[PDB]
Amino acid sequence: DSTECSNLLLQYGSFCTQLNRALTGIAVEQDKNTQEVFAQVKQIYKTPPIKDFGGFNFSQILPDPSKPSKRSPIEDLLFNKVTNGLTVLPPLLTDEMIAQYTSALLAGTITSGWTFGAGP
Amino acid sequence: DSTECSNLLLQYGSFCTQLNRALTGIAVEQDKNTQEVFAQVKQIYKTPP
Amino acid sequence: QCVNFTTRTQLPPAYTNSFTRGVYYPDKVFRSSVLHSTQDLFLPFFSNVTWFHAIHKRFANPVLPFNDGVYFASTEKSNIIRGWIFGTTLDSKTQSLLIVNNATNVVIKVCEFQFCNDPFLGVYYMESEFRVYSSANNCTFEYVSQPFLNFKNLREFVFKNIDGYFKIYSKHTPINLVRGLPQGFSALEPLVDLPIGINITRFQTLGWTAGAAAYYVGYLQPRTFLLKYNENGTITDAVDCALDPLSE
Amino acid sequence: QIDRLITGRLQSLQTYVTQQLIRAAEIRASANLAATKMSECVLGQSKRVD
Amino acid sequence: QIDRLITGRLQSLQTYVTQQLIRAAEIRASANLAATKMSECVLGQSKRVD
Amino acid sequence: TKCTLKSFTVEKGIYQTSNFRVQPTESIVRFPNITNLCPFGEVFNATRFASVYAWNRKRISNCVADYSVLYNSASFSTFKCYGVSPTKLNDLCFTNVYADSFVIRGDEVRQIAPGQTGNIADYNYKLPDDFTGCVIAWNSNNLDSKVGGNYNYLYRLFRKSNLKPFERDISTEIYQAGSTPCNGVKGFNCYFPLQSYGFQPTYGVGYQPYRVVVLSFELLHAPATVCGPKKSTNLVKNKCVNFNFNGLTGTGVLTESNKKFLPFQQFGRDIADTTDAVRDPQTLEILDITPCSFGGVSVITPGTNTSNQVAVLYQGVNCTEVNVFQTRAGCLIGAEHVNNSYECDIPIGAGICASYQSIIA
Ligand SMILES: *[C@@H]1O[C@H](CO)[C@@H](O[C@@H]2O[C@H](CO)[C@@H](O)[C@H](O)[C@H]2NC(C)=O)[C@H](O)[C@H]1NC(C)=O
Ligand SMILES: *[C@@H]1O[C@H](CO)[C@@H](O[C@@H]2O[C@H](CO)[C@@H](O)[C@H](O)[C@H]2NC(C)=O)[C@H](O)[C@H]1NC(C)=O
Ligand SMILES: *[C@@H]1O[C@H](CO)[C@@H](O)[C@H](O)[C@H]1NC(C)=O
Ligand SMILES: *[C@@H]1O[C@H](CO)[C@@H](O)[C@H](O)[C@H]1NC(C)=O
Ligand SMILES: *[C@@H]1O[C@H](CO)[C@@H](O)[C@H](O)[C@H]1NC(C)=O
Ligand SMILES: *[C@@H]1O[C@H](CO)[C@@H](O)[C@H](O)[C@H]1NC(C)=O
Ligand SMILES: *[C@@H]1O[C@H](CO)[C@@H](O)[C@H](O)[C@H]1NC(C)=O
Ligand SMILES: *[C@@H]1O[C@H](CO)[C@@H](O)[C@H](O)[C@H]1NC(C)=O
Ligand SMILES: *[C@@H]1O[C@H](CO)[C@@H](O)[C@H](O)[C@H]1NC(C)=O
């Protein structure tokens, strides 16, 4: 809150503008990264109620309806095992949205193979 | 080897720690690069005589 | 009034290991569940500290150089140690400290005293014998505070002269080992700071019978520690950054 | 003295932003690789070895 | 005098570490490409043109 | 937004323009209790004072001196300082204070000053030319004077050499006015050095006794045990204020804390080595200091060719501390929250997006 320090800091030009601009570029690039990784399908697919996949069992990778976050057991294990003018900006996609995107990808690749990645 | 210069340098904080940490990261990164290029098989094969 | 003693049996002082004691709070700052590293005058772990014995005949009251920092440990029972002597030459030519604890309260005085070559007390089994000085010419600061007080009780003390502030640290520790120091960790809290602002480079610890008494002397050295603060804010463990490579 | 503090803290901030940009470039390369893996291994079957 | 020398040499060292990090990122990209070539051309036959 | 982008036309998007800062309202200072007052009552209003040739030097140290009470007392007819400022006594610090108390005539008061030549200055009490401090004098007609003449107070009248600074002379050696030898026996030109004062109440202004106490400061390398008083204001909590606690100054919001300090500890620091809790010197309680709720201000706008309506996001700011809707990204004002879901147009953060259809969130 020092006024004399800020008065001196105006003599240094637009260094602060450069740093804020670079950090803003990094911040939007993180969201762009998450979009390009996960938001690859515009149809949200759901798995059928009957899990008859010819003996194949996807319960460890499919979402658990019991959990409040609707995460898979492996996803829940991953989230459990990974633990002055500065502000932390929240990501655009929440963990629930990324879980829904992953769930849509899993449902598409289980019920439709590779066809959902190239069209209907 | 100057102790007065090092005492004055300590007042600049942890710049030296950052530079050493970055250089160490680069150094281990080179070894990781070599491992990932060449050590792709854990099996040593020999051509027949 | 001073008296020479000659019934002592001559014996060199012993040395003993320091173990993992001697860590004190470097500042008045609270910390919780964090690891803090600081550069301050610290006693290296597992060093030889001077050992002084008093038993019957031993009555060790030598005069030692202060250097830049001194560690006092005292496996003390029935309170045989009653004071301390701090100064440069310990006579009326110069100015010294008088830090004592008699039967009523503790007195801190900064005066030009005339100390005896053999300063000692005496208890009749009631104390009525005070032989620690012969004159007191010029005082410059007087201070009265609250009293600080098989070997049962352990007293730890650290003394420093940094920029005219005389920092005293202390802890009372319940011990049950008879002969030597115990093994364990104990953080020393700051008890009193004395704004003395004087030169100090030498000090002394304060028929007949020699009561069962013992104490230790260690020295403080500039180095770096890594101190662990728990949730309640007490220093539970410490790491000397220059002791051995694992700690480094 | 304030100018000395300003240039020191400004140098620290610029060093932080520069290393953040470098880490962001590395993370962006990793995320582009992750998107490529998502497209070619999840949305299809890949003939590329390893 | 020592402060002048310290700020100059620290600026030089930071600059050196900055281009070292940038060249390390470039070399890491090249090594990732080389590992991909080793996997897809040495350990298999590639359909990717050129 | 136009000013920040330096253009009159702004395309659709969200732009960080300003930085929100909750300005401090009050200025709070707490300092510990004013204890250990200096024993000024046994000095400046004692029973009897000393003579000028044998002045008692009283040393004041290891206490706080409240110069306001002494300065506001109107009975001191002369309160003159020569090296410091009277209005700054309550802020400056000094190692120790030496009080030189003596009794002289009402006209000889001025001679206790640098650069003055006289009987009192040369033979009774001398100050250095680089003297600092204050010379305080007050009338003592009703205490020292007696109907039969107060002859107790003696002063040195003849000495062979001038006095050095702060030098006493308690010897009664016989002065030799002429050149004839004197071995301590009075003669034609040999008189006693010390003379008694003729203090009588009937005399006017000029002969009345004055009790004069002179304070001199020392600036040695020892700590300044003598400092001025401290004025602690009231405590206001749960507001962004300016706090200065025993030299630790800054800005924050002060609330009650469940952390338990050890009794010696005063300050508290977190993992990042920033102050987060301080113990109040007046009342032994621990106040958690959270920073005042700053945040980056972002402006959400469609293209200026479409509309001039804008929405404002205060990133990481609670809506109660600033069409007012609370998101996990911050407080969003100017956008009406809808319960329906669309495709993202302008990203806000934490799953929220803004679009123009009025601006909807
Ligand atoms: C698919 O796999 C899951 C887990 O691998 C099976 O769930 C187990 O079911 C048995 C009996 O129903 C329980 O004793 C186990 O505790 C379950 N495992 C877990 C991790 O909960 C499930 O039965 C399999 N088959 C189907 C059709 O879902
Ligand atoms: C106890 O012994 C010491 C050491 O012999 C005495 O200290 C000396 O005293 C004489 C005076 O008799 C001085 O001339 C010496 O300079 C002193 N020595 C030192 C090293 O200072 C001490 O006086 C003795 N105590 C009594 C009461 O005589
Ligand atoms: C301490 O000193 C004694 C003799 O001076 C020596 O025998 C001992 O080994 C020393 N202690 C250590 C830990 O070196
Ligand atoms: C302890 O020392 C103080 C300081 O001189 C004195 O006033 C007091 O009477 C002493 N008490 C005893 C029991 O000797
Ligand atoms: C110190 O004491 C001696 C003897 O008691 C005395 O001559 C001298 O004046 C004293 N010093 C001061 C500064 O009073
Ligand atoms: C203190 O006195 C010692 C002599 O015992 C001397 O070596 C040292 O230089 C003195 N230090 C200061 C600061 O006067
Ligand atoms: C901290 O103090 C509380 C006192 O209620 C105690 O219950 C707790 O065990 C202490 N913490 C540790 C790590 O001992
Ligand atoms: C004399 O001075 C002392 C200074 O501490 C003061 O407390 C006292 O009130 C004064 N006496 C009178 C009668 O005002
Ligand atoms: C200071 O004064 C306050 C208010 O009277 C009191 O609560 C407190 O106990 C006093 N003492 C200390 C050491 O703070």
Numbering used by the authors:
A (entry chain B): 745 to 827, 856 to 892
B (entry chain C): 745 to 793
C (entry chain B): 14 to 69, 77 to 145, 153 to 176, 185 to 241, 257 to 298
D (entry chain B), E (entry chain C): 992 to 1041
F (entry chain A): 299 to 620, 641 to 675, 691 to 694
Paper quotes:
Given its crucial role in the viral replicative cycle, the spike protein represents an important therapeutic target and is a critical antigen in host immune responses.
Global 3D reconstructions were obtained at resolutions ranging from (2.25–2.5 Å), yielding open trimers with one RBD in the up conformation and 2 RBDs in the down conformation for all spikes. The resolution within the NTD and RBD was insufficient for accurate visualization of mutational impacts within these domains, due to high degrees of conformational heterogeneity. Additional mutations were visualized within the Beta and Gamma variant spike proteins, with implications for inter-protomer and intra-protomer contacts.
